[PDB]
Design a protein around this ligand. Structure first.
Ligand SMILES: Nc1ncnc2c1ncn2[C@@H]1O[C@H](COP(=O)(O)OP(=O)(O)OP(=O)(O)O)[C@@H](O)[C@H]1O
Ligand SMILES: Nc1ncnc2c1ncn2[C@@H]1O[C@H](COP(=O)(O)OP(=O)(O)OP(=O)(O)O)[C@@H](O)[C@H]1O
Ligand SMILES: [Mg+2]
Ligand SMILES: [Mg+2]
Lengths: 584, 584
C-alpha cells in the first residue's frame, strides 16, 4: 500500500495581504480509510488539495511524501481527487461521463467491452441505474439531481481504481443510507490496499465505525491525528466525557467548535489554542513525529487515443446542440446570395473592376469577421479543461488538437466551401476549374488564420469580453491596410510595415491575383483606344501593377505561405497559453 | 401564521418522453418547522419548487394554497427560497451580498443604518465573522469555502425575514455543530409564527427533535406525512421496530431505501409501492384529506431604488475587474492614432475626398464592430438574473436599465469622446466648434445602435457563441449597403430597401454631410477649370449629390432620428427577451 506522509505543512493566501490558512500540520496516512473531520472553514479542502498536489507551491511550506519518497510526475495518472463542487459535463449523460473517464484513464490493454462492464458495475454499486441514461444537468436545463450528480463525480474517479484516492466531502448531498452504502463501498475498496483520504461532514455512527485514521482540523490547526478508535479515549483525558452524545463524531465537533459565534448565540486562552497545545504535548504527536523523521509525465493512454476522444466528445456537443453551426450555415447562404445578387452579371466595362475588386473585399471580410466566434472555443469549457487536466485525462496537445477539429471542420472549412460555391455560379468570376479551388483554398486560409488569432487572444481566459473586443478592433486595424480604401504605396515608410500583419491584405491580394490574370476590360472599343477618361485600365495585369502585386505565380502563393505562417504562430501562442495557464 | 397546503400535486418532465417525478402527494404545512426527508432522487427539491411556485405549470397537476386561498402575485416579495447549489455573486463580499439583498428586499422605511445592524446580527448568528469581509469565490478564483458560501446563501434569504421560508438542504455542506446552530436559529424563528419548509439530509438527533412536521419522499411518492414525534410509532405499527438505531431519522431512511441497489450490493410487491399503500390506508392520510377539503406584483422597493443598486453593484464589478474597460480605451487610443497618422494632413486635392470619405468609413466601422462586446452583458450573469428575479429583488425594467448604464457609460460613451478627440487635432477635419460635437454625437449613436442590436440578439441566451456570430455577419451585411464600395443608386429596386437597415449607412452619411458642407477641393486651379480628368468634384456639395444625400439640414438629422429609432426598437426587443424568458 501507499503511505502518504505530510510534514510541517503550512499554507498562505495572498488576498498583498497574506492570510495563514493551514498552520503547522503533521500526519501519516497509511493504507486504510482516513477521515478528516472539522468545522466549516477549518482547512479541510485546503489540506486535501495540498496532499493531492493541487495548490500553488509559492505559498506552501512543507513536503508531502509517498512511501518516504517525493511525488513522481506520474501522480495524477495514479491518484484520484473527487472535488467538492461537482465539475461534470452537463451535455453528456451519467453513462457517457463514465465512458469518457474510463476511456482515457484506463489502459487500452482493456477492450471497450471490458471497460463498459466495469462502468455497469460502478453504476450498480453507486445506485445510478434510474439515471444512467439521463443527462447530467447544466445550470439552465435541469437534469440529474444534486446527489445523483455527486455520485457521478465519485464514480468517474472510481472506475480508474487508483491506489491513493482523495474525496472532498463525498457524502455531502447524500442521505443517511446512500452515504453508508458509499463508505461501505470505500471500506471494501480500502481493504484491497488502497489508501483513501477524505474529508466528511456529519458521519453517523455506522460511518464513523469504519474509519481507520482520524484527523481533526479547526481554523487551520490540527486538533487531533491518530486512530479513530483511540480518539474518544483521548478527549476523556483532556476533560471531556462522552455520554451526552451517542455518536462520537457529534461529540468531537462540539468540542472543537465551541468558540463559534453561531453556537454561542443559538441555545447558548482561546479554545483552539488550548486544544492545539494539548495535542502537541500529547503522545499521539510524539508517535507521529518519531515516524515522520524515520520516513524522511507518462500518461496512461497515448496521444492518438486521447485525440480521438476529446474530439469525439466535442462532436457530440455540436450534434447535440447545433445552434451555432446551423445559424452559421444559414447566414452564410443568405449573405452569399446577397453578394451574388448585388454584383450579378459582372461585365468587362470601365466600371467592371471596381465591382470585381469590391466583391472580393466582402468575401475576405466575411471570413475574417466571422472568426470572432472562435473566441468561445477555449473559454466556455475552461473550468472543465482545468479539472480534467489536473485529474490526468489528457495532454494539453491532445485537448488542443482535438478541440480544433470541432471548430476547424464544422465552422471554418464547411462554410468556406458553401460560400465559395454560391458566389461562383451567380457572379460570373474566373470560369476555369483551378481558379475555383484556389479561391476556395484562399477563403479557408483567411478563415483559419483569423480563427487562430481568435484562439491566440482567448486561450486560458475566463470571459470572452476582452478577447472579442481585441478581436474586432484588430480586424478594423487590419482592414485599413488591406489595400482597398487607402493606397498601400502612398503610406509612409514607418507605417507601411503594418500591412504585413493584415490577414485581409493577404487574402484580398490572393483573390485579386487569382481573378485579374488576363481578363480584359477595354474591348468593346472604338477605333482610337477607348474614350472614357481616367484613361483606362485595360487588362487585369495593369490593375495589379497599380496595386503593387507580383504577376508571377509566386505572387499568388506568397499570400498563402504568409497565412500558413500566421496559423502556425497563432496556434503556438494559443497552445502555450493553455499549457502555461495556472491550473491550481 | 401561514398554512401552506398542497393537494393532489403531480409533476411531469419532458425529456417527447414524459417522466413522472412526483406522483400523488397531499399535505399541510402549518406554522412551525416542517422537514422533508428522503433518499437521493426521491423528489425533494422538485416538491420544494412546486411549493415555492418555481416549476413550469404545464407539467404541474395540483394546487398549492396559502391559508385556503391561492398564491397572490405578491409572493416572491413575501417568501424566501434558499436554493441548493448556492447562486451567489463571487465578485462581491459576504457582507456586500448581504447588503445587496437587504437593500432591495427590505422597505426604505428602514434606514441604511438599521439595515446594516440587521446584517451584522445575521453574520453573528450564522458564524460568518471571519469571512464577512472576504470575497465569495468564483469557480476560478478560490475564496470563501463551500459551507461558508452556503451560510451566505442562507443569510440573504434571512435578513428579509419572510413568513414562509423554504430551504433546499440548508445543512448540506455544514458540520455537526454549525448545522445544529442553524436549525436552532430556525426553531427560534419558527416560534415567531413563520412557517419553515425544508428538505434535509442526515439530521442528528438534536436536529430531528426540533421538527414539528415530517414528510418522507421516496421515488416521487409520499411515504409518510404528519407530526415528527408520531412518526416513530407509525413504523412500529407497520412492522419495523426502532432499537437498532439510536437516531430515528437514520431509522426512517433505512426503511424507505432498502430497495436501492447501492444498499443491496454493499454489506447486503416493490418496497415503495408497499410503503405507499400503507400510508394511504393509514389514519395520518385520512386526517390530512379531511382538512384539505375543509381548506379548499407590488414589489417591496420602488423602481428608482432598484435602479440605483443594480447599477451600483454593476459599477463595482467594473471597478473591481477593469480588464475589458482598460483594454477598450487602450486599443481605441492606438487605433485613433493610427487612423490619424495615415490620413495626416488632409489636403484639398483631386485625391482629398477619397481620403476624407475613407477616413470616415473606418470611424463608423470602428464604432459598429466594437459593439460586439455588448453581447456578453446579459449572458455572463444570466443565472444570477434568473435567480434574483424569481426571488423578487427587482423588476426586469430596473435590472435592464441599471445594467445598460454600466455598458453605456464606461464602454460606449467614453470611448466615443476619446476617439473623436484624437482624430480631430491630428487629421484636420471641419475645424468649427459645432461640427466637432455633431461628429462626437454621431459616433455615439452608431455605438449605441450597434450595442442595442448586440443586446437584442443576446438577451436571455446562455452562450455568446450564436449571438457573436450573427452580430458580425449582420455587420458585414450592413457594411455592403453603407454606400462606399457599391453605389446605392445602382443597386436594383428589390435590394435597395436593405440600405435602410444599415447602422453604418446612417453614421457614414451623417459624417459625410457634417464634413463635406462647403469645403472646396478644386482651388489651386489654373486659368481653365482644373485639368485633371475625371472631370473633377470641386465642392463638397457636388460629392453629396453624387452619393444621394440631402443638402438640407434635415439631411443630417434624418440619420440620427433613424439611429434613435433603432435604439428604441432594439432595446425593446432586448427588454422583452429578458421579460418573456422562461425562468422556471
Ligand atoms: N484561496 C483562498 N482565498 C481566500 N480564502 C481562502 C482561500 N483558501 C482558503 N481560504 C479560507 O480558509 C478557510 C478554510 O478553507 P477550506 O475550504 O479548506 O475550509 P473547509 O473546512 O473545506 O470548509 P467546508 O468544510 O465548509 O468546505 C475558509 O474559511 C476560507 O475562507
Ligand atoms: N427537469 C428534470 N429533468 C430530468 N430529470 C429530473 C428533472 N426533475 C427531476 N428529475 C429527476 O427526478 C428525481 C428527483 O429529483 P430531485 O432533485 O427532486 O431529487 P432530490 O430528492 O432533491 O435529490 P437530492 O436530495 O439528492 O438533491 C431525480 O432523480 C432527477 O433525476
Ligand atoms: Mg471539506
Ligand atoms: Mg433536497
Amino acid at each position: 500500500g501507499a503511505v502518504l506522509s505530510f510534514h510541517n505543512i503550512c499554507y498562505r493566501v495572498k488576498l498583498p495581504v497574506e492570510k495563514e490558512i493551514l498552520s503547522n500540520i503533521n500526519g501519516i496516512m497509511k493504507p486504510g480509510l482516513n477521515a478528516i473531520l472539522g468545522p466549516t472553514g477549518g482547512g479541510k479542502s485546503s489540506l486535501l488539495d495540498v496532499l493531492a498536489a493541487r495548490k500553488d507551491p509559492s505559498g506552501l511550506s512543507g513536503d508531502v511524501l509517498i512511501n518516504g519518497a517525493p511525488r513522481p510526475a506520474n501522480f495524477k495518472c495514479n491518484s484520484g481527487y473527487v472535488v467538492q463542487d461537482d465539475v461534470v459535463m452537463g451535455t453528456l449523460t451519467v453513462r457517457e461521463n463514465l465512458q469518457f473517464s474510463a476511456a482515457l484513464r484506463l489502459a487500452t490493454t482493456m477492450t471497450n467491452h471490458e471497460k463498459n462492464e466495469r462502468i455497469n458495475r460502478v453504476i450498480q454499486e453507486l445506485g445510478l441505474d434510474k439515471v444512467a441514461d439521463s443527462k447530467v444537468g447544466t445550470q439552465f436545463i435541469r437534469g440529474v439531481s444534486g446527489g445523483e450528480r455527486k455520485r457521478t463525480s465519485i464514480g468517474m474517479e472510481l472506475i480508474t481504481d487508483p491506489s491513493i484516492l482523495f474525496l472532498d466531502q463525498p457524502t455531502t448531498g447524500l442521505d443517511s443510507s446512500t452515504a453508508n452504502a458509499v463508505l461501505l463501498l470505500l471500506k471494501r475498496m480500502s481493504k484491497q490496499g488502497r489508501t483513501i483520504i477524505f474529508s466528511i461532514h456529519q458521519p453517523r455512527y455506522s460511518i464513523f465505525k469504519l474509519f481507520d485514521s482520524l484527523t481533526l482540523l479547526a481554523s487551520g490547526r490540527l486538533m487531533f491525528h491518530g486512530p479513530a478508535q483511540e480518539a474518544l479515549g483521548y478527549f476523556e483525558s483532556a476533560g471531556y466525557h462522552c455520554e451526552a452524545y451517542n455518536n462520537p463524531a457529534d461529540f468531537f465537533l462540539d468540542i472543537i467548535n465551541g468558540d463559534s459565534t453561531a453556537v454561542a448565540l443559538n441555545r447558548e486562552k482561546p479554545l483552539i489554542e488550548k486544544l492545539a497545545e494539548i495535542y502537541v504535548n500529547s503522545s499521539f504527536y510524539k508517535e507521529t513525529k518519531a515516524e515522520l523523521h524515520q520516513l524522511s509525465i507518462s500518461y496512461t493512454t497515448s496521444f492518438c487515443h486521447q485525440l480521438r476522444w476529446v474530439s469525439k466528445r466535442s462532436f457530440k456537443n455540436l450534434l447535440g446542440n447545433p445552434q451555432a453551426s446551423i445559424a452559421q450555415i444559414i447566414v452564410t447562404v443568405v449573405l452569399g446570395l446577397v453578394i451574388g445578387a448585388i454584383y450579378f452579371g459582372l461585365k468587362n466595362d470601365s466600371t467592371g473592376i471596381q465591382n470585381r475588386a469590391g466583391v472580393l473585399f466582402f468575401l475576405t471580410t466575411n471570413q475574417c469577421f466571422s472568426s470572432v466566434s472562435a473566441v468561445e472555443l477555449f473559454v466556455v469549457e475552461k473550468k472543465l479543461f482545468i479539472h480534467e487536466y489536473i485529474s490526468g485525462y489528457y495532454r494539453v496537445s491532445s485537448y488542443f488538437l482535438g478541440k480544433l477539429l470541432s471548430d476547424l471542420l464544422p465552422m471554418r472549412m464547411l462554410p468556406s466551401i458553401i460560400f465559395t460555391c454560391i458566389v461562383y455560379f451567380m457572379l460570373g468570376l474566373k470560369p476555369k476549374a483551378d481558379a475555383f479551388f484556389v479561391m476556395m483554398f484562399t477563403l479557408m486560409m483567411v478563415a483559419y488564420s483569423a480563427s487562430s488569432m481568435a484562439l491566440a487572444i482567448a486561450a486560458g481566459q475566463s470571459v470572452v469580453s476582452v478577447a472579442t473586443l481585441l478581436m474586432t478592433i484588430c480586424f478594423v486595424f487590419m482592414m485599413i491596410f488591406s489595400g482597398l480604401l487607402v493606397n498601400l504605396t502612398t503610406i509612409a515608410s514607418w507605417l507601411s510595415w503594418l500591412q504585413y500583419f493584415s490577414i485581409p491584405r493577404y487574402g484580398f491580394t490572393a483573390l485579386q491575383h487569382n481573378e485579374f490574370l488576363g481578363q480584359n476590360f477595354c474591348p468593346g472599343l472604338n477605333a482610337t483606344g477607348n474614350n472614357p477618361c481616367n484613361y483606362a485600365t485595360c487588362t487585369g495585369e495593369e490593375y495589379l501593377v497599380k496595386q503593387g502585386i507580383d504577376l508571377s505565380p509566386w505572387g499568388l502563393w506568397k499570400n498563402h505561405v504568409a497565412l500558413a505562417c500566421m496559423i502556425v504562430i497563432f496556434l503556438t501562442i494559443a497552445y502555450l497559453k493553455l499549457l502555461f495557464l495556472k491550473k491550481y
